Amino acid sequence: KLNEIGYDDIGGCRKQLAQIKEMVELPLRHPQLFKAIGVKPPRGILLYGPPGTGKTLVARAVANESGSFFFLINGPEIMSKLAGESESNLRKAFEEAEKNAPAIIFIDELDAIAPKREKTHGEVERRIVSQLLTLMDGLKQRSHVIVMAATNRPNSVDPALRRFGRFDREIEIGIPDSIGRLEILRIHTRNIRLAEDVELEKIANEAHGHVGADLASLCSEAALQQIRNKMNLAEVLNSLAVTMDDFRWALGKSNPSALRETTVEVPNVTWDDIGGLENVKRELQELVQYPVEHPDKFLKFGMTPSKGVLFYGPPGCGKTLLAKAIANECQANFISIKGPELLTANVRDIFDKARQAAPCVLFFDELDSIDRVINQLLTEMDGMSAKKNVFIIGATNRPDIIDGAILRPGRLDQLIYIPLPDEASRVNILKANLRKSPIARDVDINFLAKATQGFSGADLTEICQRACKQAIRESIEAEIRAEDPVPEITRRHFEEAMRFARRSVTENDVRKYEMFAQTL
Amino acid sequence: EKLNEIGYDDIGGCRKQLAQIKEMVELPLRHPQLFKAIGVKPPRGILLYGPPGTGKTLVARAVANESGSFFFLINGPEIMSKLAGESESNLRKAFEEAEKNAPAIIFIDELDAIAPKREKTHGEVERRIVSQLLTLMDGLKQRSHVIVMAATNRPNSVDPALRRFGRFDREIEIGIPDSIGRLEILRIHTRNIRLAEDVELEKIANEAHGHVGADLASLCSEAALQQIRNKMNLAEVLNSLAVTMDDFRWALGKSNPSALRETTVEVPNVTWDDIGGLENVKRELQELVQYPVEHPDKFLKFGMTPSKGVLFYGPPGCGKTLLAKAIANECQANFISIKGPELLTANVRDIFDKARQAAPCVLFFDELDSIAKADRVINQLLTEMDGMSAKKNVFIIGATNRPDIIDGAILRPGRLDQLIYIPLPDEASRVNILKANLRKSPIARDVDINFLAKATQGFSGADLTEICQRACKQAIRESIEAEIRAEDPVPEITRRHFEEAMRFARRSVTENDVRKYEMFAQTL
Ligand SMILES: */C(=C\C(=O)Nc1ccc2oc(-c3ccccn3)nc2c1)c1ccncc1
Ligand SMILES: */C(=C\C(=O)Nc1ccc2oc(-c3ccccn3)nc2c1)c1ccncc1
C-alpha cells in the first residue's frame, strides 16, 4: 500500500504540493535540461506546520510519483538506540540513499534528532547532531539525493542545520481551507458508505480549525453514532449509511486541536456585505489593488507604492470587515492579529509568515493597546521593503493616544476615517445579517434603515438578534400551547426589538472624531 | 581537481579584505628574506568572521592556491562528530601534517563549533578539546611557516582564551558586499548561464539589497527556473534558452535575502546636489569632517586635536540623515546609520568597534533623544565615546528633534562639542529636492519646478516627497483609467497632476516649531 500513495491521497495542501512537485520531480526526471541552463537543484527541504496534517506523506507521495528511491529515518526511533547505534544508522541511511539514486530521505521529527543546542545536555546528543551536519554537507553536487525533513516549528531545530547548503528551503504545510477540508473529507470517506442526504460541502465549510487527523476522527465518530442509533434497537450490516444528522452530531462533539492556530487564506467577504463609502473604497483600491494589478505603471512612473494604511473611527466590525473585503477583492491572503493576542519574538514570526504569502493583507486590530513590542513592530515595519506586496493595515478607536512614531512616513503614513454607515450601508448590512434567515415578505428593510440612524454595525446586528429571539420564543410558546405558526420573522418582532434603540455612539464621540479629522 | 584552481578571481564581494590578506600572507610566504631582514613578524592567527554565505570559506583556499602553499582543512562539525580520542588525534594530526609541509595554511572552518564559550561547554571532552587547540596554537614556533586561519559567524562566540596575543590576534571581517561586490558576484555565478542580450546586471546588483553571495546564487537559479518554466512548459528548445531581464526582475521580486537585518557599511551615493542645504552648515561640516582627514599635517603643525562629534537639531525630516550621508560621500568615508529604535532593542561597543575598524567613518546616531534623557545605554555610550581617541578619523554625528531634552552630559566637551542646527530647506534647496525626486521618472516639458518651489515654503523634505508621490499616483490613476476605456495616452506626468496634488497643499511643520528652534539657537 505504501508504494501506492500518490498526489491524490493527500489533501489540504495543493499549492505546496505544486511547489514541491516543480522543485523535486522535474529535476529528477530531466536532469540534463536543468543542468544545461545551470539550475542548481535544492538539497534540503524542511516542511513544518501543525501536527496532524499530511506533511508526513508528502515525502512518500513525491518519491512514488517521481519513481525514486525513498528512505525514512524516524527521529524517535534513532534516538531510542545505544550510543553507536544512532550514528551507525544515520550513516547507513545516507550511504544507502547514495547507493540508489536519485533518492529522497525523509527525516521525520527532526527536532527530536537535532533540537536546539541548549536543550541538548549530553555528549551523545551533540555527537549525533554533528554527525547529521557532516553527512548533510557531504552530499555531492551531483549525487541526486534530496533530504526532506518535517518538524512542528523550525525554531526548535538546531540553527546550524538551517544554513545554506544544509536546509535552505523551508515550506509550511498549514491548516487546510474549506476546499482542502472538502478534499480531505472526500479522501477519508472513500470506504465509508454514505447516505444520499450527505452534503460534504457544508461539513467542510462548518469544520473550522480542523486538520486532516481531526477530520478522520470526525468521520469515525459519525460512523459510530450511526452504529449507536441503529444497532441499539447481516440485514442491519447492509443497511448502514451515515446521515447528515450523524455528521452534524459528530461536529457538535468534536474538539479540533488546531483552534488557536492562525489562519491564512482568501476571505469570502465582498463589498456588498459592508456597503461602506465610495471614497474609502477608492482609496483602498488605489493603495492595494493597483500595485499588484499593474506594477508596470508604478515602475514606468517610477514611484514606489506605500505599504500600509491606518483606519480610525468609532468601534465596530466595519474596519475589520472592510479590510477583509479589500483583501477578497485582490484575492490576497488575510492575516488577522488582535492586540490581546500579541500581548500574550513572535512579531518577527508573524511578519515572516506574511512575507511568505506574496499578496497578503496583514491586519492589526486594537493597535492602541500596543514598549518592547512597540519597538519590535517599529523596527519590523521600518525594515520592510516597500517593493514586496505586503500591506499592513492598522485599526484603532482612540487615535489620540496612538504614539506618533507609528504615524511617521514609511511605516503607517495614511489615515482614513470610518464613519457610521449611511442609509445605503445600513440597508446592505441588514440584508447581509438576515441573509441566512427566513425573513417574511411584509418586512421592508428600507424603512428599518430610515428609522435607524447613527447605529453602528454592532447595533444593527443586535437588533437582528433581538428579533430572532422573539420569533424563537413565540415558536416555543406556540408549540407548547399546541401540545409552523411562526414560520418567519414578522413585523411585530422587529418593532419589539426596535423598542430598545440603544445607540452605542454618542454625538460627542462623533464630534471628537470630526475634530480629529479636521486637525489632520 | 577544481578545488586546487580556485583563485582571487573566483571570490567576489571582498576585495579590500582580499588585498589585506594578500599583503599579510602571500608576501611573507614568498619572500621571507626581506621580512626577516627588516624584522617583521608574520602573523600566526587570522580569524575571519561575518554573516554566513559571504564566501569567506574560499578565502583560505584562494590564498593557499595563489601562494602555492600547502592547505589543510579542519571542519568543526566533522571533528566534533568523532569519539573522545578521535577528535584529539585529528587536531594533532592536522597541525603535525601542516608543520611537516611548510609553508602551510590551516583553515579551521566553524571554529565556534570546536571552541565555544567556556560556559556553553558542559562536558569534559569539550573543554579537553578546547585546551588541546590552545596548546597546539601556542606551540607554533615563529620559525615554522604555519598560518592558522579560522572562520566564525561572530568572534564573541569563540572562547576568549583563543583571542589572545599569540593565538588569534588578527581579526578580519568579511561582511555584506556593496553594489560593486554584488555585480562581481553576479558575474562570477552567471559564467555558465547563457544570458539574453537585454540583461544588464548593473541594475540587478544595484537593486539587490541585503543579498550575500549565496542569495545571489539562489537568485540566478530562480531566474533560470522561471525562464525554463515559461518557455519549455509552453533539442531546439534546449538551444533557445536564455535568461531575460524579466526573469531576473521576477526572481528579485520573490527573493527573501537572509541578510536584511545586518548593518551596512559603505560610502553612500548621496551628493550635495540632492539636498541643497545652507552654505554655513556645508562649510562647517566640510571643515570638521574633511580638513582633519585631508590635511592632517596642518592640524599637527598647529597642534590642536580635531573635535570628533557634531550634533544636529531641528525640524524632523530627511535633511539631517541626507546631510550626513552627503558629507560622508564627499570624503569617501564609510557611513554607519544606527537608528534609535535599533539600539533600544555589548551592542554599543560592537557598533563602536565596527566603526573603528573602518578608519574614515561617519558613524550616525539618529533619534538620539530616545536613547538619552535609558541609564544603562546612555552611560555605556558616554563611556565608549570618552574612550574614543581623537587622533583617529572616526566622526560621531547625532540627530535629534527635541534639542531641549538631550542630557547636557552628551554635549560636554570631548563628546559632542558642536551643536549645529538644521533649519527648514529654502527655495533653492526645495528646487534641488524636487529635481532629485522626479529625476528617475519622466516629466512633461511644460512642468516647471521653479513655480512649484516658489509656492512651497516651509515644506519639509517629506512634504516635498509627498507632493511628488501624490502627483504620480494621480498620473497612474489617470493612465490606467484611459487604458480600460481604450480596451500611450499618458506618456508623462502632466502639470495638471502636479497642480491637483498642490490643491491639498499642506505644511507638516508649524511655524511655532521653527520659532521654537530659533529660540533654542538664540539661547545657545
Ligand atoms: C466585529 C467586531 C465587533 O463588533 N467589534 C467591537 C464591538 C464593540 C466594541 O466596543 C468597543 C469599545 C472599545 C473601547 C471602548 C468602548 N467600546 N470595541 C468594540 C469592538 C467583527 C470583526 C470581524 N469579523 C466580523 C465581525
Ligand atoms: C527621510 C526620512 C523622513 O522624512 N523621515 C521622517 C519624516 C517625518 C517625521 O516626523 C517625525 C516626527 C518626530 C517626532 C514627532 C513628530 N514627527 N519624524 C519623522 C521622520 C529619509 C531618510 C533616509 N534616507 C532618505 C530619506
Query: What cell numbers appear for B281 in the block?
Result: 552648515
How far apart, in whole angstroms, are the C-alpha atoms of residue A362 and residue A355?
Answer: 10
**Dmax (CA) of chain A:** 84
**Dmax (CA) of chain B:** 84
How far apart, in whole angstroms, are the C-alpha atoms of residue B234 and residue A188?
Answer: 36
Q: Is the CB of A408 under 6 A from ligand 2?
A: yes
CA-based torsion, A336, A339, A342, A347: positive or negative: positive
A172 interaction partners in chain B (CB closer than 8 Å): none
CA of A318 to the centre of ligand 1 (A): 9
Give me the helix-helix angle, B461-486 and B427-437, nearest 10°: 40
Q: What are phi and psi of A164, to 5 degrees?
A: -60, 135
B476 interaction partners in chain A (CB closer than 8 Å): 290, 294, 297-298, 301
Query: What cell numbers appear for A160 in the block?
Result: 546550524
Environment class of B109 (CB within 10 Å of its CB; exposed 0-12, middle 13-18, buried 19+): buried
Question: For an interface test with A, which of B73, B228, B321, B367 has the most A Cβ atoms less than 10 Å from its Cβ?
Answer: B228
CA of B223 to the centre of ligand 2 (A): 36
Residues with Cβ < 8 Å from B97, sequence gap 6 or more?
B72
**CA separation, residue B514 to residues B42, B418, B458 (Å):** 59, 20, 9
Residues in chain A: 520
How far apart, in whole angstroms, are the C-alpha atoms of residue A317 and residue A320?
Answer: 6
Question: Euclidean distance between the first and final Cα of chain A, in Å?
Answer: 67
CA of A511 to the centre of ligand 1 (A): 20
Q: What are phi and psi of B121, to 5 degrees?
A: -90, 125
Task: Give the 3-state secondary structure of residue B72.
Answer: strand
Query: What cell numbers appear for B346 in the block?
Result: 555589548
- Pick the residue whose CA is nearest to atom 7 on ligand 1: A316
DSSP B293-347: HH-HHHHHHHT-PPP-EEEEESSSSSHHHHHHHHHHHHHT-BB-EE-HHHHH--H
- Header resolution in angstroms: 3.1
3-state secondary structure B91-106: HHHHHHHHHHCCCEEE
Q: Mark yes or no for CB contact B241/A36 under 8 Å.
A: yes
Q: Mark yes or no for CB contact A37/B77 under 8 Å.
A: no
Q: Mark yes or no for CB contact B77/A355 under 8 Å.
A: no
What is the DSSP pairing of strand A415-417 with strand A309-312?
parallel
Q: Is the CB of B318 under 6 A from ligand 2?
A: yes
- Asked whether the beta carbons of A45 and A148 are under 8 A apart, the reply is yes
Kindly report the number of other CB atoms within 10 A of residue B115's CB atom.
27
Question: For an interface test with A, which of B81, B87, B191 has the most A Cβ atoms less than 10 Å from its Cβ?
Answer: B81
- CB-side exposure of A508: number of CA atoms within 13 Å? 0
The identity of residue B274, as a single letter, is D
Residues with Cβ < 8 Å from B305, sequence gap 6 or more?
B299, B390, B391
Give me the helix-helix angle, B495-503 and B461-486, nearest 10°: 120
Query: What cell numbers appear for A508 in the block?
Result: 460627542
- Asked whether the beta carbons of A121 and B123 are under 8 A apart, the reply is no
DSSP A113-153: HSB-TTT--SHHHHHHHHHHHHHHHT--TTS-EEEEEEES-
How far apart, in whole angstroms, are the C-alpha atoms of residue B98 and residue B106?
Answer: 7
- Asked whether the beta carbons of B189 and B231 are under 8 A apart, the reply is no
Q: What are phi and psi of A183, to 5 degrees?
A: -60, -45
CA-based torsion, A220, A225, A230, A232: positive or negative: positive
Question: Euclidean distance between the first and final Cα of chain B, in Å?
Answer: 70
The identity of residue A518, as a single letter, is Q
**CA separation, residue B245 to residues A155, A277, A296, B252 (Å):** 36, 42, 14, 10
**CA separation, residue A448 to residues A434, A436, A452, A470, B166 (Å):** 13, 18, 6, 17, 88
How far apart, in whole angstroms, are the C-alpha atoms of residue B77 and residue B151?
Answer: 13
Query: What cell numbers appear for A192 in the block?
Result: 465509508
**CA separation, residue B331 to residues B19, B314, B491 (Å):** 22, 24, 40
- Asked whether the beta carbons of A367 and A341 are under 8 A apart, the reply is no
The identity of residue B483, as a single letter, is E
Breaks (C-N over 2.5 A) in chain B follow: 234, 345, 373, 487
- Asked whether the beta carbons of B338 and B311 are under 8 A apart, the reply is no
Residues that constitute the known binding site of B: 57, 109-110, 321, 366
Query: How far, in whole angstroms, is CA B217 from its chain's centroid?
Result: 20
Query: What cell numbers appear for B266 in the block?
Result: 559603505
Task: Give the 3-state secondary structure of residue A29.
Answer: helix
Q: Mark yes or no for CB contact A130/B260 under 8 Å.
A: no
- Choose the residue to mutate in B209, B318, B336 for probing ligand 2, maximizing ligand atoms within 8 Å of C-beta: B318
> What technique was this entry resolved by?
cryo-EM
CA of A512 to the centre of ligand 2 (A): 27
Q: Mark yes or no for CB contact B466/A297 under 8 Å.
A: no
Closest-CA residue to A307 (of A238, A400, A216, A406): A406
Q: Mark yes or no for CB contact A37/B227 under 8 Å.
A: yes
Bond before A102 cis per omega within 30 degrees: yes
Q: What are phi and psi of A427, to 5 degrees?
A: -60, -45
Run of H or E including B77: helix B76-80
Buried b (16+ CB within 10 A) or exposed e, A99-135: eeebbbbbbbbbbbbbbeeeebeebebbbbbbbbbbb
**CA separation, residue A29 to residues A23, A67, A113, B190, B235 (Å):** 11, 9, 31, 24, 16
Q: In what order do the strands lie in the sheet with B309-313?
A: B337-338, B364-365, B396-400, B309-313, B418-421
Buried b (16+ CB within 10 A) or exposed e, A27-60: bbeeeebbebbbbbbbbbbbbbbbebbbbbbbbb
How far apart, in whole angstroms, are the C-alpha atoms of residue A95 and residue A73?
Answer: 13
Give the nearest partner residue to A37 out of B122, B194, B209, using CB atoms: B194
Closest-CA residue to B211 (of B250, B175, B173, B172): B175
DSSP B415-453: T--EEEE-----HHHHHHHHHHHTTTS-B-SS--HHHHH
Q: Mark yes or no for CB contact A39/B228 under 8 Å.
A: yes
| Strand-pair partners of A69 | A103
How far apart, in whole angstroms, are the C-alpha atoms of residue A445 and residue A428?
Answer: 9
CA of A258 to the centre of ligand 1 (A): 25
Give the nearest partner residue to A303 out of B243, B344, B441, using CB atoms: B441
Task: Give the 3-state secondary structure of residue B52.
Answer: coil
For B50-131, strand residue ranges (E) read: 70-75, 104-109
Environment class of B121 (CB within 10 Å of its CB; exposed 0-12, middle 13-18, buried 19+): middle
A408 secondary structure, DSSP code: S
B129 interaction partners in chain A (CB closer than 8 Å): none
- Pick the residue whose CA is nearest to atom 25 on ligand 2: B318
Nearest-neighbour CA in chain B from A407: distance (Å): 13
- Asked whether the beta carbons of B365 and B308 are under 8 A apart, the reply is no
DSSP A186-243: HHHTTSSPBPTT--HHHHHHH--S--HHHHHHHHHHHHHHHHHHHHH--TGGGS--B-
Place of cell 489562519: A263
Query: What cell numbers appear for B453 in the block?
Result: 518651489
How far apart, in whole angstroms, are the C-alpha atoms of residue A388 and residue A292?
Answer: 10
- CB-side exposure of A78: number of CA atoms within 13 Å? 27
How far apart, in whole angstroms, are the C-alpha atoms of residue B312 and residue B363?
Answer: 13
Closest-CA residue to B479 (of A288, A279, A299, A280): A299
- Asked whether the beta carbons of A393 and A363 are under 8 A apart, the reply is yes
Comparing alpha-carbon positions, the chain B residue that sits nearest to A41 is B221
Query: What cell numbers appear for A355 in the block?
Result: 512575507
